[PDB]
Amino acid sequence: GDTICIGYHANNSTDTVDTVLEKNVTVTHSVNLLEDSHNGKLCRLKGIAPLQLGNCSVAGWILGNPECELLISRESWSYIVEKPNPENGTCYPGHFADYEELREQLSSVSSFERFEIFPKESSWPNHTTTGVSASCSHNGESSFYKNLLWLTGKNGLYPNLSKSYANNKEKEVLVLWGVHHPPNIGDQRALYHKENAYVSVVSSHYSRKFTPEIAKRPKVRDQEGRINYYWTLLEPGDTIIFEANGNLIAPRYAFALSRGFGSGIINSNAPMDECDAKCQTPQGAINSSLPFQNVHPVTIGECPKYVRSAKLRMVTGLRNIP
Amino acid sequence: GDTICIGYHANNSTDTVDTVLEKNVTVTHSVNLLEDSHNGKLCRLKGIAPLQLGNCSVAGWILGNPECELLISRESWSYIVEKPNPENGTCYPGHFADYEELREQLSSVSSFERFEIFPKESSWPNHTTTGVSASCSHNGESSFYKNLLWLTGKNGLYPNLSKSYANNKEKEVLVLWGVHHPPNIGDQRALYHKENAYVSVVSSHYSRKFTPEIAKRPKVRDQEGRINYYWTLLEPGDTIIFEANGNLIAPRYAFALSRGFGSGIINSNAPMDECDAKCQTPQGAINSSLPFQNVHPVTIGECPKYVRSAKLRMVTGLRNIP
Amino acid sequence: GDTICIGYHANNSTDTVDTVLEKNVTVTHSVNLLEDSHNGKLCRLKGIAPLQLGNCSVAGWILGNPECELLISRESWSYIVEKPNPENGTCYPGHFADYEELREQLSSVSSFERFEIFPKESSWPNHTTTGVSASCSHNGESSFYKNLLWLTGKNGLYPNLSKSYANNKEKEVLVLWGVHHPPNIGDQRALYHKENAYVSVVSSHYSRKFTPEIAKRPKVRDQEGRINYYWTLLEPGDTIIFEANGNLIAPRYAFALSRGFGSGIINSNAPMDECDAKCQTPQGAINSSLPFQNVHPVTIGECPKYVRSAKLRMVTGLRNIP
Amino acid sequence: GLFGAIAGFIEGGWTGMVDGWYGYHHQNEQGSGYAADQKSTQNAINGITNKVNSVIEKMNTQFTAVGKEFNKLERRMENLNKKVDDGFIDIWTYNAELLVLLENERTLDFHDSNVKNLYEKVKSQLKNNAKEIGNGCFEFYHKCNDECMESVKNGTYDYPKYSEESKLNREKI
Amino acid sequence: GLFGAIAGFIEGGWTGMVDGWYGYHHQNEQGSGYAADQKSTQNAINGITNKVNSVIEKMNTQFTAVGKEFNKLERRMENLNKKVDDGFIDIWTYNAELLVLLENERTLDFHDSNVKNLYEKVKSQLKNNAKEIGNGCFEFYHKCNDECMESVKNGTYDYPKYSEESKLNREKI
Amino acid sequence: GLFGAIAGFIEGGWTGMVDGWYGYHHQNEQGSGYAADQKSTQNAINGITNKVNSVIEKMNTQFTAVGKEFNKLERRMENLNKKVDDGFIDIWTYNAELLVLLENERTLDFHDSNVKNLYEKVKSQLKNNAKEIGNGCFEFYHKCNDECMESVKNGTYDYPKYSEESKLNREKI
Amino acid sequence: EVQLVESGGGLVQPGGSLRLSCAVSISIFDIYAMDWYRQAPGKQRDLVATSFRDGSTNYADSVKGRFTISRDNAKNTLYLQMNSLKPEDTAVYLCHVSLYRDPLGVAGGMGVYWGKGALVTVSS
Amino acid sequence: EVQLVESGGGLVQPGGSLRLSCAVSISIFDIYAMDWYRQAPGKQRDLVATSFRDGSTNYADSVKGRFTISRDNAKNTLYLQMNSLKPEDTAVYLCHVSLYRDPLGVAGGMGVYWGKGALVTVSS
Amino acid sequence: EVQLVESGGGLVQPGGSLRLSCAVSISIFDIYAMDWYRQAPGKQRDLVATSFRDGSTNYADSVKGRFTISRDNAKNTLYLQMNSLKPEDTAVYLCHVSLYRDPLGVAGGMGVYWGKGALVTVSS
Ligand SMILES: *[C@@H]1O[C@H](CO)[C@@H](O[C@@H]2O[C@H](CO)[C@@H](O[C@@H]3O[C@H](CO)[C@@H](O)[C@H](O)[C@@H]3O)[C@H](O)[C@H]2NC(C)=O)[C@H](O)[C@H]1NC(C)=O
Ligand SMILES: *[C@@H]1O[C@H](CO)[C@@H](O[C@@H]2O[C@H](CO)[C@@H](O[C@@H]3O[C@H](CO)[C@@H](O)[C@H](O)[C@@H]3O)[C@H](O)[C@H]2NC(C)=O)[C@H](O)[C@H]1NC(C)=O
Ligand SMILES: *[C@@H]1O[C@H](CO)[C@@H](O[C@@H]2O[C@H](CO)[C@@H](O[C@@H]3O[C@H](CO)[C@@H](O)[C@H](O)[C@@H]3O)[C@H](O)[C@H]2NC(C)=O)[C@H](O)[C@H]1NC(C)=O
Ligand SMILES: *[C@@H]1O[C@H](CO)[C@@H](O[C@@H]2O[C@H](CO)[C@@H](O)[C@H](O)[C@H]2NC(C)=O)[C@H](O)[C@H]1NC(C)=O
Ligand SMILES: *[C@@H]1O[C@H](CO)[C@@H](O)[C@H](O)[C@H]1NC(C)=O
Ligand SMILES: *[C@@H]1O[C@H](CO)[C@@H](O)[C@H](O)[C@H]1NC(C)=O
Ligand SMILES: *[C@@H]1O[C@H](CO)[C@@H](O)[C@H](O)[C@H]1NC(C)=O
């Protein structure tokens, strides 16, 4: 007799998916929903390269640590790469105020230019601007931060100083400075020629008075002294006024910046490359339209949702019965 | 022959729903799960009207800005309406301490009464209570906050002042005060007849000592001086003790309040109306039992879950094949 | 004729489940996904017992309140049980700084040993170490905290004191101390023989200077004076340096600890027992592999996800039609 | 269709049947008309009503307020607050869209099943007394008045009464 | 039922069949009894066991603690902590209730499908040797001993052996 | 299978049919071959493509950054930030695994339904001109050339032309 | 399409009795709800009585204890037995039917029909 | 209902052999697990041996290497071949059957049955 | 398996006309897309023209206005009518077919086949 039969497809596929009723079902065709591979390198996000701090921390980079002279160049980045435990930060020991907040503010900046807010030669006629320290050594020589000046007395005097800066740059200007706390009154008289000093930093919305705290304290980086670091964001059209009769670590270079909200800092040991991506992880970068990944929870930008799943494969074909 | 047929319904419906296998399917009957319309007006929530600050901010309202004399009246509200960029806040420049926390505390108050904690006539026999400023102008006249008093010297003296208030109102009493920081020592001697002054505000659980910081600083609202604003919540049965020999901006009116937790502040330009709702947005109010809305993420009260969806219509009828 | 029939099972089951199309459907077999019962007792979590503070708070326990002498013994716990409103905390009124942070740090500690950081007999040759207060009474006698010493003058003098401790314990050492603020200058001269005193506490990463604030303030626990409490975590190999010429409440006992992150504090009135569990609530403990519970949102450890559901029973059998 | 009836072997719907979702069309000497099956329509309405009630009323909303404010030294907390709000909106959006998509397919499958079940019910009643045209219709091998049609719809149709007359017409053909 | 068998053309269940979910009832001269189909019951148990395992064991729980404390100047952070806790509880409640509702309908559909498939398997074996009563039963046109019944249940039933005897009884009727 | 065809009464698949998911195998005097049903295969591809597009493209991702930093007096905020991140990862993991599990069962049910529907379509066309072998095959009671097979596959098969010849062979047997 | 025809409407003296009947073209056995509405000139439509599929009945307070609603399944007829009639009971009585129970408008409110009306006048 | 009847129980001298048999009223072909339990006076029920549908076998350490469990599908009989008997092997032996593999109690533990028992005594 | 055989390939003088044909062993009625590719020595494969199931057509810019693609359903043949031929149009022309519309590779790209090729040479 003559026969016609109804049947269905089969192939050599070894794909397996999981279903509600049965696990590990072999199927003819399937698609993967889970990205589980990276390229092991750092790529451009949003089209622009990231800032590699290398050996430095954000604290060392933004203050101008003598061992970070190579990082001053760049003025554009999308995210920041920092070593897990950075070796070069605040070479002179002290408390960096609101440091995490500052790292969040600097997480991404579209335009970022450095300019000498108080020129070293013109701004301090009656103060010594050459102060250095062995804790901030560069090439076996005592140095200091590039963006700060250690003001000490000249001709046996530390006169009252008053210095203002008006932000005419039509962008937020980041100003950093410091206050020095000597270990003993003797060092205080030698450096600033006074026992009671004060530092005042005020703007239209900022106001804080600093008083040196002289005490003996454990040696950090071979220094019993301390320099507390401070910062403020000066809005365009606003003035910041520095008044001090001692202990001020004055600003030399400031930063006019324009933000790029939503980015951040990653801790990675992965090398750099010229690739581009919408997603980058500390392990490496990722592509694909896949809506899920299990590479790393810490992502940057628009990334597939991280899931702990080891496998997310949905069937499109039939049960494979060859 | 005689025939009977099995069939199904059809109509002129043009509704479309999306399904897993097919998009934009025409169906006979459907229901909407997504609210996408508002009335464009502000309504009563929980049955009671909201407080419209109009031109003022929470800072100007609670301190008693001379340009907010119309808002003193009301004593009941469920949420607060504030202009996006309020024009009238702290007319005298200074730092409002824990301002966001205070806006969260005042987000909703079931019962809220204002009373003169330190009467202007009886409380200050040996101090001048008439101090005003051009920065706080009302009707072209120099004025000052309604709930604070600027205490200055009288008969060439600023005597030591000590003033206590015991909270016998069986409700939390909100007390606000201020500390004045002159721009120069000359103004300090003229106003308070001393170079070193102090303000002390203490309760059973609050304790803070204030010291004037005299420095030259940028002009905000034509003033180089500053008034820092502070506040505390005085529990029933507790005492607050004011001690100062200068620079105190003393409380005149305080606030006994009872809270209504869970509400907040919205920024809106929508006009007011007498409607009622379980949900209100800055665009307008919403009703319906629908479990989803795409009107606005910022909601007040019990609202349909905000979703970014443009359409959430589920089919109840059949595929429409007329 | 001879017949064979196809049919399905039925029994006396009264179980009911809910389905999309129909509610309250009787079924032959079902499983429960929702745990709704506890044992009403406190159990060991991770295999080890929890610390019961009984009548004391974390503040009273860690400072050594005279009424908490029974809690000093234990050195191992997984979570902490505290009465809702603890009756015995800071017997001498004052501000405990960063108290919530400290409760979070102490939420769980794997190894916790108490040692005399500054021995009472050897450490203070030129200061009185016997100061007590009626606010810290034990057995009708004026006493004081066990882990702190109230240093006052001896032989009409309060000499400059300098005391250092180097953390050689290879574990974080928790150091607590205090600063006393008298109600009047008279009491300040009587106790510390000076009108202007200072307390300085510094480590490699900690630095703070304290100045007594002398003011009249409301009586808390029959005291117009105040003792502000402070604490720091001293890393291994680091030194803490105490320098003061008055008003210091010196440390007597410190704590070397090793953490067990991820746990916390529960407020319960449930009695103690020897049971073990992966989950414990203030109502009681829970077992079972069930993935959901409605007992209590506040859980400790690996617990079934809390849901507001009253019933989560899924059918495994058929519709029961007997 | 998952069950093969709607848009399957019953190719179209009837605008003429206003009274119900599923129903009958009959043609005999007395007349022609559309009739609705109230029993199977009511069952579908009850099930889908409970389905709509489930989706809508499992969503319980507490009185809350999303908006929060932060100062310039609280940027991390502002971004954490933003991550919470965007995160819940992400999930609820994805859950709502996926729920509506999947349950719309199930709802149309449900009607396909109900129609198919009604066709098999009638076919099980008529047996050899009628032949399947293939378009959801049965052609009776006997005469069937309006009372006989009403017995088919009510499920009270009697097979023996018309069996012998059907056998003779079937034998003739 | 979505497949029309349970609460459909097989109107009831059997308390007398203790051994299985699906099975047979036979009546011949030798005896009458309830028998269970172990093959189709075991398949349903395996599938639903894996279904329960999936729901339960996809939920992985880390050691955590919900409770947190805040002071009086930390009200915004206390409310943010509350928004996180209430938000996750909102989602997990909605997910758990919706999951149980939908998968309960699918589980009852699953049994309806298994019963229907077993009925079609037997009908495909018996063919013209028996007639469908309509209530899930078949009436044999031949005699069928206990060994013949066991062949129907085991699916090893032999059609040719009883075909001629069935044809004669069918011709007589 | 939920519909009883795949791994049911059609026990196996055909590696020989490369062109499609569902199709035919025919045997006549002229030849033997595998043919694919392009219409029902294309419908399945369209539905499952839209199903994949739905799962993938409902997931919209904003440009964001998870990582945050905190000091030693901010432990509560670090744990709150951790509770947010772990909480969303918990939910998305559970949603993704459950979604893939459930929709994989529905996708295999979908193919079972499509095969079954195609078998019923052919059976509805052939009627008494062929007999069901039971393994997804029909045995023609008449001769059927390659043009007749192509009419069965195209659904344009003509029943009257071969009805009389089929009746005579059916009567002979 | 379903046709509803009332009958029995006429004038009646107070204290009398009257039964109204409503003829449905379709079998009434499975109909969810069948209602009697009355409307007087210058007044709104008022729900008087309702009969449900389960056999339950709902009456307005005004007609309670005096009116009885019932359905004859065999004649496809709905009856309203009105006793102890008062002059205020004068109205045009309307037969209403609802085939299905659809609280959420799931089926679009299909299966609802209205009769033509029958005038009842209680005078003298 | 399923009936399990043991047989072959009697007394036996040490070092001997004995086979026990269990008669099932229902076809044993598809039964998941069939077990032999033994219970001595003053002792608990002990799992001795188990036969599975796939043909696998599980034995307790005490009886391992001396006992053999097997099923005869055609006779619907389960056998326990006991060799090298020791006096400590004295017990009442119980035939147990489990129709399905149900680890989670999904089916409520249906399909489990117990035999009546057969006494085996090893003495002298 | 599906067989595609081209024909009509030969040499042609510029400005001439030529029609190529592709014979498919399987009915072409429901085929989603049928393509003509051309490849010159030292060049890549170029999509010349495409015919779709709905009747739409897509042409490359180079051949647009001069080439016409069409399918004869009855003869299972795909035609490429080439007019106004230029010497640059010299290539080996390839018949390609795609049974289904599968943008996401859901079906693994099954139903795609290639012809053997036909050489067209425009010279002199
Ligand atoms: C920038 O970071 C680098 C590390 O990448 C610092 O170099 C390291 O500095 C420490 C001193 O703090 C050195 O340890 C000491 O070395 C001296 C001389 O060998 C020895 O006498 C001490 O006992 C101690 O071991 C360390 O060797 C050195 N590492 C290297 C590779 O040279 C550097 O000081 C940082 N500079 C600034 C400005 O932050
Ligand atoms: C309350 O808010 C209103 C705005 O809604 C304030 O009025 C505005 O005040 C500013 C001064 O801060 C005015 O700008 C100045 O105006 C003067 C006089 O015209 C001019 O000489 C200056 O060059 C500058 O433009 C502004 O015009 C004025 N707006 C209006 C509509 O009058 C008001 O000062 C606030 N009052 C308090 C107590 O906060
Ligand atoms: C530890 O906590 C206990 C409570 O569990 C405290 O005992 C209570 O102390 C208060 C005083 O602060 C007593 O109130 C007063 O009692 C005296 C004497 O009876 C009376 O003259 C006062 O008018 C006032 O009522 C309270 O009675 C007492 N409770 C008990 C049960 O004795 C204790 O003071 C705390 N100790 C420390 C060191 O924190
Ligand atoms: C812990 O403190 C509580 C106070 O709440 C003590 O309980 C009270 O004890 C007094 C007697 O000293 C009784 O008059 C009260 O009735 C008790 N309160 C309650 C609620 O029963 C308790 O005794 C203290 N614990 C210890 C060990 O002393
Ligand atoms: C992502 O990139 C890799 C390498 O280029 C590639 O193999 C993969 O196909 C890409 N993802 C998708 C979805 O195409
Ligand atoms: C919400 O209010 C509008 C206007 O009153 C109304 O049209 C709408 O039906 C209401 N929502 C619901 C669910 O009824
Ligand atoms: C949890 O413990 C109780 C008491 O011991 C017990 O009844 C219950 O079965 C346990 N949960 C599970 C899933 O077994």
mmCIF file of N, CA, C and O in Angstrom, chain C residues 46 48-49 51 61-62 72-79 105-115 169-174 233 254-261:
data_model
loop_
_atom_site.group_PDB
_atom_site.id
_atom_site.type_symbol
_atom_site.label_atom_id
_atom_site.label_comp_id
_atom_site.label_asym_id
_atom_site.label_seq_id
_atom_site.Cartn_x
_atom_site.Cartn_y
_atom_site.Cartn_z
ATOM 1 N N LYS C 46 24.849 29.070 63.838
ATOM 2 C CA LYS C 46 26.192 28.680 63.411
ATOM 3 C C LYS C 46 26.830 27.677 64.372
ATOM 4 O O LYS C 46 28.023 27.364 64.243
ATOM 5 N N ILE C 48 26.866 28.067 67.813
ATOM 6 C CA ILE C 48 27.300 28.699 69.054
ATOM 7 C C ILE C 48 26.196 29.592 69.604
ATOM 8 O O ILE C 48 25.375 30.134 68.857
ATOM 9 N N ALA C 49 26.200 29.755 70.928
ATOM 10 C CA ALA C 49 25.122 30.437 71.626
ATOM 11 C C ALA C 49 25.174 31.948 71.398
ATOM 12 O O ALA C 49 26.207 32.494 71.007
ATOM 13 N N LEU C 51 24.735 36.000 72.841
ATOM 14 C CA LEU C 51 24.965 36.787 74.044
ATOM 15 C C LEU C 51 23.667 37.447 74.486
ATOM 16 O O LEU C 51 23.104 38.269 73.757
ATOM 17 N N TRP C 61 26.852 47.192 78.564
ATOM 18 C CA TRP C 61 27.674 45.985 78.545
ATOM 19 C C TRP C 61 29.126 46.306 78.218
ATOM 20 O O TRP C 61 30.047 45.858 78.915
ATOM 21 N N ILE C 62 29.352 47.088 77.164
ATOM 22 C CA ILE C 62 30.713 47.316 76.697
ATOM 23 C C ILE C 62 31.468 48.301 77.585
ATOM 24 O O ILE C 62 32.695 48.193 77.707
ATOM 25 N N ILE C 72 30.219 39.810 81.906
ATOM 26 C CA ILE C 72 31.628 39.920 81.535
ATOM 27 C C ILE C 72 32.197 38.577 81.096
ATOM 28 O O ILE C 72 33.182 38.524 80.348
ATOM 29 N N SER C 73 31.575 37.477 81.522
ATOM 30 C CA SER C 73 32.197 36.161 81.407
ATOM 31 C C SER C 73 32.425 35.753 79.956
ATOM 32 O O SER C 73 33.542 35.387 79.570
ATOM 33 N N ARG C 74 31.382 35.821 79.135
ATOM 34 C CA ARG C 74 31.387 35.129 77.853
ATOM 35 C C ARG C 74 32.317 35.783 76.836
ATOM 36 O O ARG C 74 32.580 36.987 76.876
ATOM 37 N N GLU C 75 32.815 34.954 75.909
ATOM 38 C CA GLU C 75 33.798 35.366 74.913
ATOM 39 C C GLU C 75 33.467 34.842 73.519
ATOM 40 O O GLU C 75 34.320 34.910 72.624
ATOM 41 N N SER C 76 32.264 34.314 73.308
ATOM 42 C CA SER C 76 31.894 33.791 72.000
ATOM 43 C C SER C 76 30.391 33.912 71.822
ATOM 44 O O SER C 76 29.630 33.566 72.729
ATOM 45 N N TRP C 77 29.973 34.404 70.658
ATOM 46 C CA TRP C 77 28.553 34.505 70.343
ATOM 47 C C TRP C 77 28.382 34.703 68.843
ATOM 48 O O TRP C 77 29.303 35.137 68.143
ATOM 49 N N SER C 78 27.181 34.376 68.362
ATOM 50 C CA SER C 78 26.802 34.564 66.965
ATOM 51 C C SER C 78 25.879 35.757 66.757
ATOM 52 O O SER C 78 26.038 36.487 65.776
ATOM 53 N N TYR C 79 24.915 35.971 67.652
ATOM 54 C CA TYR C 79 24.080 37.164 67.625
ATOM 55 C C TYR C 79 23.855 37.636 69.056
ATOM 56 O O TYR C 79 24.229 36.965 70.021
ATOM 57 N N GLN C 105 29.502 47.026 64.621
ATOM 58 C CA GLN C 105 30.804 46.363 64.665
ATOM 59 C C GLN C 105 30.779 45.154 65.588
ATOM 60 O O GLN C 105 31.377 44.115 65.282
ATOM 61 N N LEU C 106 30.112 45.279 66.729
ATOM 62 C CA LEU C 106 30.015 44.212 67.711
ATOM 63 C C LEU C 106 28.899 43.221 67.409
ATOM 64 O O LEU C 106 28.629 42.353 68.246
ATOM 65 N N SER C 107 28.242 43.334 66.248
ATOM 66 C CA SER C 107 27.095 42.476 65.946
ATOM 67 C C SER C 107 27.450 40.999 66.066
ATOM 68 O O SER C 107 26.617 40.180 66.470
ATOM 69 N N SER C 108 28.683 40.643 65.721
ATOM 70 C CA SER C 108 29.159 39.278 65.894
ATOM 71 C C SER C 108 30.677 39.299 65.973
ATOM 72 O O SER C 108 31.329 40.015 65.206
ATOM 73 N N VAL C 109 31.227 38.524 66.905
ATOM 74 C CA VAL C 109 32.665 38.455 67.131
ATOM 75 C C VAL C 109 33.024 37.003 67.424
ATOM 76 O O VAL C 109 32.488 36.409 68.365
ATOM 77 N N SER C 110 33.921 36.428 66.619
ATOM 78 C CA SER C 110 34.265 35.017 66.780
ATOM 79 C C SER C 110 35.093 34.790 68.041
ATOM 80 O O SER C 110 34.829 33.855 68.806
ATOM 81 N N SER C 111 36.097 35.633 68.273
ATOM 82 C CA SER C 111 36.936 35.558 69.463
ATOM 83 C C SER C 111 37.028 36.941 70.085
ATOM 84 O O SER C 111 37.343 37.912 69.394
ATOM 85 N N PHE C 112 36.776 37.021 71.391
ATOM 86 C CA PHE C 112 36.593 38.296 72.085
ATOM 87 C C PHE C 112 37.121 38.151 73.509
ATOM 88 O O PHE C 112 36.483 37.503 74.341
ATOM 89 N N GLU C 113 38.271 38.762 73.792
ATOM 90 C CA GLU C 113 38.890 38.663 75.107
ATOM 91 C C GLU C 113 39.099 40.046 75.713
ATOM 92 O O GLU C 113 39.451 41.005 75.016
ATOM 93 N N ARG C 114 38.876 40.137 77.019
ATOM 94 C CA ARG C 114 39.020 41.378 77.765
ATOM 95 C C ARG C 114 40.325 41.353 78.549
ATOM 96 O O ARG C 114 40.646 40.351 79.198
ATOM 97 N N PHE C 115 41.074 42.451 78.488
ATOM 98 C CA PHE C 115 42.349 42.548 79.179
ATOM 99 C C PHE C 115 42.533 43.966 79.696
ATOM 100 O O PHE C 115 42.021 44.928 79.120
ATOM 101 N N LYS C 169 48.695 42.343 70.023
ATOM 102 C CA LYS C 169 47.816 41.189 70.162
ATOM 103 C C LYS C 169 47.422 40.555 68.831
ATOM 104 O O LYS C 169 46.660 39.583 68.835
ATOM 105 N N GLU C 170 47.914 41.074 67.704
ATOM 106 C CA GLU C 170 47.635 40.536 66.370
ATOM 107 C C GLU C 170 46.142 40.460 66.067
ATOM 108 O O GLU C 170 45.722 39.710 65.182
ATOM 109 N N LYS C 171 45.341 41.238 66.790
ATOM 110 C CA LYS C 171 43.910 41.360 66.562
ATOM 111 C C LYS C 171 43.509 42.801 66.844
ATOM 112 O O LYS C 171 44.213 43.531 67.544
ATOM 113 N N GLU C 172 42.378 43.215 66.279
ATOM 114 C CA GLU C 172 41.853 44.541 66.574
ATOM 115 C C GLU C 172 41.544 44.661 68.059
ATOM 116 O O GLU C 172 40.914 43.779 68.650
ATOM 117 N N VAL C 173 41.995 45.755 68.663
ATOM 118 C CA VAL C 173 41.750 46.039 70.069
ATOM 119 C C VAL C 173 40.783 47.211 70.147
ATOM 120 O O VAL C 173 41.064 48.296 69.624
ATOM 121 N N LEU C 174 39.634 46.979 70.776
ATOM 122 C CA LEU C 174 38.635 48.023 70.974
ATOM 123 C C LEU C 174 38.941 48.779 72.260
ATOM 124 O O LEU C 174 38.950 48.190 73.345
ATOM 125 N N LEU C 233 39.020 51.543 67.088
ATOM 126 C CA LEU C 233 39.554 50.205 66.858
ATOM 127 C C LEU C 233 41.028 50.314 66.497
ATOM 128 O O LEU C 233 41.378 50.869 65.451
ATOM 129 N N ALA C 254 40.391 46.895 77.970
ATOM 130 C CA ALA C 254 40.149 46.946 76.535
ATOM 131 C C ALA C 254 39.722 45.563 76.044
ATOM 132 O O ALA C 254 39.620 44.608 76.820
ATOM 133 N N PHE C 255 39.480 45.452 74.738
ATOM 134 C CA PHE C 255 38.960 44.218 74.152
ATOM 135 C C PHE C 255 39.684 43.903 72.854
ATOM 136 O O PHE C 255 39.617 44.679 71.897
ATOM 137 N N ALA C 256 40.359 42.757 72.821
ATOM 138 C CA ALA C 256 40.897 42.208 71.585
ATOM 139 C C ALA C 256 39.851 41.284 70.973
ATOM 140 O O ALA C 256 39.379 40.355 71.636
ATOM 141 N N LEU C 257 39.482 41.539 69.721
ATOM 142 C CA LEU C 257 38.383 40.805 69.110
ATOM 143 C C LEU C 257 38.726 40.389 67.687
ATOM 144 O O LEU C 257 39.629 40.936 67.050
ATOM 145 N N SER C 258 37.991 39.388 67.209
ATOM 146 C CA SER C 258 38.038 38.947 65.823
ATOM 147 C C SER C 258 36.604 38.793 65.339
ATOM 148 O O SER C 258 35.784 38.165 66.013
ATOM 149 N N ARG C 259 36.305 39.360 64.176
ATOM 150 C CA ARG C 259 34.926 39.575 63.763
ATOM 151 C C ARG C 259 34.309 38.326 63.134
ATOM 152 O O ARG C 259 34.990 37.358 62.791
ATOM 153 N N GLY C 260 32.985 38.373 62.988
ATOM 154 C CA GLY C 260 32.212 37.362 62.293
ATOM 155 C C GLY C 260 31.097 38.029 61.513
ATOM 156 O O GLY C 260 29.934 37.989 61.922
ATOM 157 N N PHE C 261 31.450 38.642 60.382
ATOM 158 C CA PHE C 261 30.575 39.596 59.708
ATOM 159 C C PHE C 261 29.237 38.969 59.329
ATOM 160 O O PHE C 261 29.124 37.755 59.140
#
